[PDB]
Amino acid sequence: TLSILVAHDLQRVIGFENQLPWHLPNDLKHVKKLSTGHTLVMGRKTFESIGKPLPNRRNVVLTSDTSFNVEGVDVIHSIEDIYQLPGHVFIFGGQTLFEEMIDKVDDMYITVIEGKFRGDTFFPPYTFEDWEVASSVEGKLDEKNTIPHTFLHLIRK
Ligand SMILES: NC(=O)c1ccc[n+]([C@@H]2O[C@H](COP(=O)([O-])OP(=O)(O)OC[C@H]3O[C@@H](n4cnc5c(N)ncnc54)[C@H](OP(=O)(O)O)[C@@H]3O)[C@@H](O)[C@H]2O)c1
Numbered sequence: 001t002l003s004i005l006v007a008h009d010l011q012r013v014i015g016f017e018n019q020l021p022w023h024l025p026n027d028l029k030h031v032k033k034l035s036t037g038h039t040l041v042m043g044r045k046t047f048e049s050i051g052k053p054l055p056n057r058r059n060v061v062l063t064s065d066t067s068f069n070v071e072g073v074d075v076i077h078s079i080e081d082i083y084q085l086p087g088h089v090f091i092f093g094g095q096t097l098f099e100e101m102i103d104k105v106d107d108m109y110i111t112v113i114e115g116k117f118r119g120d121t122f123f124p125p126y127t128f129e130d131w132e133v134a135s136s137v138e139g140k141l142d143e144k145n146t147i148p149h150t151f152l153h154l155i156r157k
């Protein structure tokens with residue numbers, strides 16, 4: 001299985017100044033749960049944003065940098081390399097990766113951030129004519145999680 005993992009707002013903002021525009025612990029727990037024991041593929045910028053590989057999963061970084069050789073990280077240099085990775089593969093971002101892979105993935109796990117944030121990077125447009133709603137689950141709000149959010153699982157029709 002090849003999947004997208006993404007958090008985007010009402011206008012498909014995904015990022016601002018190489019970070020998430022929102023603080024939402026529950027989204028990070030959601031991502032952690034879904035990808036534990038599986039594979040994450042991310043762009044170089046996204047990896048430098050996170051700063052270190054995520055534990056208990058395979059971290060794969062796509063970059064043109066031939067000097068890239070980071071402890072606990074596997075490196076790929078082409079989009080084609082993704083299809084040779086075994087198991088459940090999750091496209092982890094960022095904008096460039098999502099744009100390159102939205103037409104290729106089997107399904108998408110989306111956290112819709114039900115707000116309007118300032119962004120400089122975006123998830124590409126998509127229509128529900130192409131995607132079946134496998135599940136839609138309203139995130140629970142509390143002191144630590146104050147922005148309404150919905151977890152969508154979409155499967156390509
Ligand atoms: N909300 C979310 O779910 C989410 C998730 C992840 C990231 N983000 C956000 O997304 C933004 C980053 O997105 P971005 O598009 O600027 O950067 P990015 O996708 O994370 O990475 C861009 C880099 O990926 C490498 N790359 C991509 N395609 C390649 C290819 N086909 N061959 C070789 N290298 C390739 C290149 O690295 P080199 O220049 O080193 O060659 C490129 O500069 C940030 O704001 C971040 O916070 C949001």
Ligand SMILES: Cc1cc2nc(-c3cscn3)n(-c3ccc4c(N)nc(N)nc4c3)c2cc1C
Binds near residue numbers: 018029031032091110
């Ligand atoms: C502990 C932790 C820290 C994180 N920092 C970030 C981050 C920094 S800049 C852009 N994202 N994330 C990330 C990285 C990728 C995704 C994704 N594809 N989808 C979703 N929904 N959330 C993410 C959170 C993170 C995810 C986790 C689990």
